[PDB]
Design a protein around this ligand. Structure first.
Ligand SMILES: Cc1cc2nc3c(=O)[nH]c(=O)nc-3n(C[C@H](O)[C@H](O)[C@H](O)COP(=O)(O)OP(=O)(O)OC[C@H]3O[C@@H](n4cnc5c(N)ncnc54)[C@H](O)[C@@H]3O)c2cc1C
Length: 448
């Protein structure tokens, strides 16, 4: 219960009501600081617990794959808080006017939410702050070290962020106190109408069969843990050597759960540190879930235009500007990129994995984004196309890891300058021939 995990969004006078947890990013009962700190606040005020979820009007911008993944985990979530005597109230509409109305109707005393450096959360936060009179608090329940505490300034590279983050690990890498149930307390239809409005935009093939295959990742808190145990037991030892081979499913497969907050990265880090495996593989994994994941929150928190060309490092901006006018080898529209109708079969195979499974392998996710920059009229058009394709079809999309990852591939964020080349400039280059010498491309293409 470190007080450094909490910050004040609006200082006011708490009323005689239940501490209302506005769950947005961490959709889990266990291992949730915001839920834990809300319970502590409610206990110190002799007040019950309150959990509120908002079903925003922005779910039409995504597919059924994300809607069903989040909604199915909500059903498991609701029965989980019921066992803890914690009622769950789910609202549909704008968070700005629905959270404010809820606080007035239920006479809530204190409002608490989880942290999200994305632009949408800030848009919702400003609306709620202007329509409430109760104190509003926010808890960083997604990062092992709080985003504002890891660093006070945007970090240029993982070389400069790793020593800072590991310094605060002994203070902040701790276990989760048990969630105390309430002493006393006072989706199927919603899901059905959501998919009915999302059916016309569902991805279909020539024979009109659905593209998405939903058996690859079962949503829910229970399934997220089971993926964690299987990764550690069977797929952690070989992670260091085979994490760059798409043909092998050596990855943890925890990104869809981590994005929706169905499992805490802290518990994953706690479990992998206790487990015994190859030291190189262990360090490679913590380098991904701790260093590169949390720098994404740092990148989005300290860069207002994190999804724009303005957030690129100056060496990349000058290099891309000097090679703006080079004649591109090929140009592809958004529709051509979407259907996978390019001249590169590796790119087409990666896009097919994205369309079918909803989760593209991390190694090819660097090839997939960089080739978009190669075959785009401008770097800005590459950013727009990559972001749209990422957020539309990825189960882990609309996440700070996505925008930091896209900026890494296109704008060189958290990278260094490489050999100068036409069109792409000094940005890191990955070729089809290069991938052939790293992994068997043929098996990847045939699979998808
Ligand atoms: C262009 C591009 C876009 C991306 N968009 C997303 C996205 O929308 N959502 C998303 O969750 N990930 C994104 N990633 C980051 C990364 O690719 C994924 O986290 C990772 O591939 C997911 O696979 P995994 O977690 O099952 O396996 P693992 O390799 O074991 O990843 C474990 C965890 O480490 C983190 N991680 C791994 N690689 C990275 C990385 N390059 N940057 C930041 N964190 C990382 C992830 O949080 C991940 O959960 C993107 C990467 C790129 C290159």
């Amino acid at each position: 219960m470190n007080p450094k995990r909490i910050r004040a969004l609006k200082s006011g006078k708490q009323g005689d009501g239940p501490v209302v947890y506005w769950m947005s990013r961490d959709q889990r009962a266990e291992d949730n600081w915001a839920l834990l700190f809300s319970r502590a606040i409610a206990k110190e005020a002799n007040v019950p617990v309150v959990v509120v979820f908002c079903l925003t009007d922005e779910f039409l911008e995504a597919g059924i794959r994300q809607y069903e993944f989040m909604l199915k985990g909500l059903q498991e979530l609701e029965v989980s808080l019921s066992r803890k005597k914690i009622p769950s109230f789910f609202l549909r509409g704008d968070p700005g006017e629905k959270i404010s109305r809820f606080v007035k109707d239920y006479n809530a005393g204190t409002l608490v939410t989880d942290f999200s450096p994305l632009r949408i959360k800030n848009q919702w936060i400003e609306k709620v702050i202007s329509g409430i009179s109760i104190p509003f608090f926010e808890v960083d329940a997604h990062n092992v070290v709080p985003c504002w505490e890891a660093s006070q300034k945007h970090e240029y590279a993982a070389h400069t962020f790793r020593p800072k983050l590991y310094a605060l690990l002994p203070e902040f890498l701790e276990e989760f106190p048990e969630l105390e149930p309430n002493s006393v307390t006072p989706l199927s239809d919603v899901l059905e109408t959501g998919v009915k409005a999302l059916l016309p935009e569902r991805a279909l093939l020539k024979n009109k069969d659905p593209l998405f295959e939903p058996w690859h990742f079962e949503p829910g808190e229970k399934a997220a843990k089971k993926v964690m145990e299987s990764f550690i037991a069977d797929r952690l030892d070989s992670y260091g050597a085979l994490r760059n081979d798409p043909t092998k499913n050596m990855l943890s497969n925890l990104s869809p759960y981590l994005h929706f907050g169905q499992i805490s990265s802290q518990r994953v880090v706690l479990e992998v540190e206790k487990a015994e495996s190859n030291p190189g593989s262990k360090k490679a994994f913590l380098d991904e879930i701790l260093i590169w994941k949390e720098i994404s929150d740092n990148f989005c928190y300290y860069n207002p235009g994190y999804d724009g060309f303005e957030s690129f490092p100056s060496w990349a901006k000058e290099s891309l500007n000097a090679h703006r006018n080079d004649v591109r080898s090929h140009i592809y529209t958004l529709e051509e990129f979407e259907a996978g109708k390019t001249h590169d079969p590796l790119w087409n195979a990666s896009q097919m994995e994205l369309l079918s499974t909803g989760k593209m392998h991390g190694y090819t996710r660097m090839y997939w984004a960089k080739k978009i920059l190669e075959w785009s009229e401008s770097p800005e058009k590459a950013l727009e196309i990559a972001i749209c394709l990422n957020d539309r079809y990825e189960l882990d999309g609309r996440d700070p890891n996505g925008y930091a990852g896209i900026a890494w591939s296109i704008g060189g964020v958290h990278d260094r300058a490489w050999g100068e080349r036409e069109v792409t400039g000094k940005i890191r280059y990955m070729s089809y021939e290069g991938c052939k010498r790293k992994f068997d491309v043929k098996l990847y293409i045939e699979k998808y």
